[PDB]
Amino acid sequence: AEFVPPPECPVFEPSWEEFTDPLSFIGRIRPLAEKTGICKIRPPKDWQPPFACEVKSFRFTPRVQRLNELEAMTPREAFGFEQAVREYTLQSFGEMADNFKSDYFNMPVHMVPTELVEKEFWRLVSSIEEDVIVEYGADISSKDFGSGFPVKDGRRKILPEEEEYALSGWNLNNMPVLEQSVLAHINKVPWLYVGMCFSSFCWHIEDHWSYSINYLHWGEPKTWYGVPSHAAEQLEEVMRELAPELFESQPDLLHQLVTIMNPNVLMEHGVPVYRTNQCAGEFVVTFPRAYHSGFNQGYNFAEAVNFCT
Numbered sequence: 001a002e003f004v005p006p007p008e009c010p011v012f013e014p015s016w017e018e019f020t021d022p023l024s025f026i027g028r029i030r031p032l033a034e035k036t037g038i039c040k041i042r043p044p045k046d047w048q049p050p051f052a053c054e055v056k057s058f059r060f061t062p063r064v065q066r067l068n069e070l071e072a073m074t075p076r077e078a079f080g081f082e083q084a085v086r087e088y089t090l091q092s093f094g095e096m097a098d099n100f101k102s103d104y105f106n107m108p109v110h111m112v113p114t115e116l117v118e119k120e121f122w123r124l125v126s127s128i129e130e131d132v133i134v135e136y137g138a139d140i141s142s143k144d145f146g147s148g149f150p151v152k153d154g155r156r157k158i159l160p161e162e163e164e165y166a167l168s169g170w171n172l173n174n175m176p177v178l179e180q181s182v183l184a185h186i187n188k189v190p191w192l193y194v195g196m197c198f199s200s201f202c203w204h205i206e207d208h209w210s211y212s213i214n215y216l217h218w219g220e221p222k223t224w225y226g227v228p229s230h231a232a233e234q235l236e237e238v239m240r241e242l243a244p245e246l247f248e249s250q251p252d253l254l255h256q257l258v259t260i261m262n263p264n265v266l267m268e269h270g271v272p273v274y275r276t277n278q279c280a281g282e283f284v285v286t287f288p289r290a291y292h293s294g295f296n297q298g299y300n301f302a303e304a305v306n307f308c309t
């Protein structure tokens with residue numbers, strides 16, 4: 001009855017030698033990681049970049065997420081006016097996020113097991129008797145208040161011990177993003193995600209089937225689910241079979257806005273699914289055409305960008 005956690009995706013702990021170049025390292029781990037879709041990379045213990053966002057000015061309006069919006073399809077009065085998008089700071093969002101989680105579980109936020117938040121998230125997604133609503137500071141451009149990584153653009157001070165991280169290849173601002181094409185001869189920045197408990201992103205692949213790299217700067221873990229690219233057509237078949245008929249014929253770019261599905265449903269149809277808990281300071285790499293989704297365990301701050309090889 002309860003949620004069955006998928007098997008864990010690979011976790012790599014590269015030495016300082018292997019950590020020298022990200023593209024070479026990802027190319028070496030590819031024979032295994034491309035068979036799981038996603039993988040986690042723990043940097044060496046002494047690799048600790050600072051947080052370089054403009055915190056004093058960081059203001060955002062997170063989007064409202066109703067967990068059971070799809071199960072509710074199968075009309076309430078004044079639908080569409082459930083909750084307005086409101087402005088937070090990092091501090092005020094974190095206070096709201098911690099208060100929500102501690103009130104919901106009746107525990108301190110860091111004492112709640114990750115398996116319990118996971119089991120409760122999927123129960124709420126399919127629940128018609130309990131309407132839980134959360135907020136997600138998602139798709140915040142790094143050009144607004146700066147990247148979480150230090151950058152040498154002359155906008156914010158960089159200490160001498162921090163210059164290493166502004167020049168590091170693992171700095172998401174230093175990832176290659178320019179795809180090769182003839183049009184490029186004839187003629188992208190990271191995004192930020194401020195999460196709270198139960199805030200989520202649904203199943204999707206990247207534009208142009210691109211790689212993606214994701215870094216959790218700080219906070220509570222981000223829970224991931226990934227499908228290897230060799231099962232991409234299997235997942236899309238399961239989606240079309242079980243998606244509402246109103247959304248079944250929608251283009252993939254639009255359907256990916258509401259592609260929420262319990263991983264056990266995919267596993268029961270033969271789709272291989274892997275999971276991981278991405279903790280603060282760890283990278284998650286998604287491979288080409290690897291479907292992925294997930295949710296946040298609590299107040300956290302992530303940075304993501306598509307990169308090309």
Ligand SMILES: CCCO[C@@H](c1cc2nccc(C(=O)O)c2[nH]1)c1ccccc1Cl
Pocket residue numbers: 063136138139193200201202203204214222256257302304
């Ligand atoms: C309201 C959340 C927005 O969801 C993003 C999103 C993608 C993504 N990929 C990796 C990690 C996260 C993460 O929220 O941490 C992601 N969020 C998204 C979901 C489906 C389709 C397209 C887009 Cl743009």
Ligand SMILES: [Mn+2]
Pocket residue numbers: 204205206212286292
């Ligand atoms: Mn993604």
